[PDB]
Amino acid sequence: AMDDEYTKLLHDGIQPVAAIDSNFASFTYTPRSLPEDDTSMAILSMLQDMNFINNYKIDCPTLARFCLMVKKGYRDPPYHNWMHAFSVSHFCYLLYKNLELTNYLEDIEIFALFISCMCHDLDHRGTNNSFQVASKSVLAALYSSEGSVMERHHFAQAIAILNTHGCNIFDHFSRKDYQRMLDLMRDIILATDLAHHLRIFKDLQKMAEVGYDRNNKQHHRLLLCLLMTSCDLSDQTKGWKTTRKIAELIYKEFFSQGDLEKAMGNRPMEMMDREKAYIPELQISFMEHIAMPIYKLLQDLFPKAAELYERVASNREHWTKVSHKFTIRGLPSNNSLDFL
Numbered sequence: 001a002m003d004d005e006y007t008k009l010l011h012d013g014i015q016p017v018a019a020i021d022s023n024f025a026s027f028t029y030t031p032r033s034l035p036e037d038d039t040s041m042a043i044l045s046m047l048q049d050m051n052f053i054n055n056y057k058i059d060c061p062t063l064a065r066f067c068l069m070v071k072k073g074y075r076d077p078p079y080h081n082w083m084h085a086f087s088v089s090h091f092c093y094l095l096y097k098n099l100e101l102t103n104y105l106e107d108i109e110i111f112a113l114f115i116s117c118m119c120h121d122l123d124h125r126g127t128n129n130s131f132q133v134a135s136k137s138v139l140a141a142l143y144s145s146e147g148s149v150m151e152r153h154h155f156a157q158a159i160a161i162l163n164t165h166g167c168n169i170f171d172h173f174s175r176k177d178y179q180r181m182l183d184l185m186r187d188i189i190l191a192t193d194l195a196h197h198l199r200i201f202k203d204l205q206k207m208a209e210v211g212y213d214r215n216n217k218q219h220h221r222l223l224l225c226l227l228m229t230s231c232d233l234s235d236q237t238k239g240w241k242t243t244r245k246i247a248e249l250i251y252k253e254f255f256s257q258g259d260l261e262k263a264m265g266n267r268p269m270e271m272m273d274r275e276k277a278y279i280p281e282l283q284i285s286f287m288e289h290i291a292m293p294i295y296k297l298l299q300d301l302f303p304k305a306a307e308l309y310e311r312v313a314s315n316r317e318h319w320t321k322v323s324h325k326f327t328i329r330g331l332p333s334n335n336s337l338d339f340l
């Protein structure tokens with residue numbers, strides 16, 4: 001159903017977003033409930049709704065071909081796959097719809113954000129940055145002096161897609177705007193390195209304290225940074241079932257890297273060591289120390305974003321609640337102590 005795929009994608013209309021689901025454009029929509037078969041069409045619906053296609057006279061063949069090439073540029077580790085990218089892109093669309101980004105950022109910045117969302121984890125292998133370095137990967141070999149190893153590769157892969165014949169959805173920009181767009185993507189993608197976020201966190205607080213100034217150029221940069229990290233973590237803004245299930249995949253991925261490190265004779269981080277990792281406290285810590293501050297910062301800049309923070313805080317309480325279930329009380333389901 002692969003070339004079947006390009007053809008349908010291109011020669012039918014692009015569905016109106018509302019026809020996808022009546023709640024497609026609300027903060028309570030879970031993008032991962034859309035069949036993976038429909039997600040490319042969905043990307044195009046959002047692009048058309050956000051008016052970028054008919055704004056920039058983008059080649060529908062080029063655009064549909066971009067989309068499928070982006071999708072195909074993901075591997076299939078448990079977490080860092082296309083459905084991640086898709087729901088991350090979808091949240092960006094939500095932000096643009098519910099928060100009115102056009103009053104905050106230039107059309108080009110928003111386009112670069114959405115597109116960086118599609119591409120921000122391309123060709124991920126289920127290993128992190130410290131793995132690249134520790135294992136002397138060829139990615140660590142090329143990007144050897146400044147960290148953000150994977151993020152540098154994700155941007156590199158996005159670049160190589162745009163430079164594939166019939167995939168340059170930017171080949172309509174002036175050379176000036178083309179450069180600007182590439183520098184935008186690099187910055188937004190790079191911002192998805194958690195180390196980056198921790199570096200600029202103080203500056204984000206400040207901007208939120210004094211208030212976003214649209215004539216401040218450094219505010220534009222910080223906003224786009226905060227918005228992108230809000231997109232990368234948006235699974236935490238949905239239901240309990242979503243955080244629960246996203247913990248499954250995360251930990252499945254992490255533990256595989258740990259098993260591999262052990263085999264190479266490295267010592268894995270605890271959260272990657274399936275023998276040592278206590279998932280409930282790892283989640284609460286992650287929630288309390290990473291994701292919560294992101295959505296609080298977003299609530300401070302954007303008062304309509306408040307429901308998202310309160311979702312994320314409610315998801316944390318719930319890990320607190322079910323946290324006792326990770327000590328086996330009574331007997332296992334089968335009434336057996338064999339597992340001993």
Ligand SMILES: CCCOc1cncc2nnc(-c3cnn(C)c3-c3ccc(CC)cc3)n12
Binds near residue numbers: 193197232247286
């Ligand atoms: C930090 C390690 C904990 O990992 C996670 C644990 N629970 C949920 C989760 N959702 N995404 C992550 C995660 C996995 N790897 N990375 C790099 C992230 C992550 C983290 C932050 C950002 C904003 C800067 C972007 C991505 N998660």
Ligand SMILES: [Mg+2]
Binds near residue numbers: 192
């Ligand atoms: Mg990433």
Ligand SMILES: [Zn+2]
Binds near residue numbers: 120
């Ligand atoms: Zn990501």
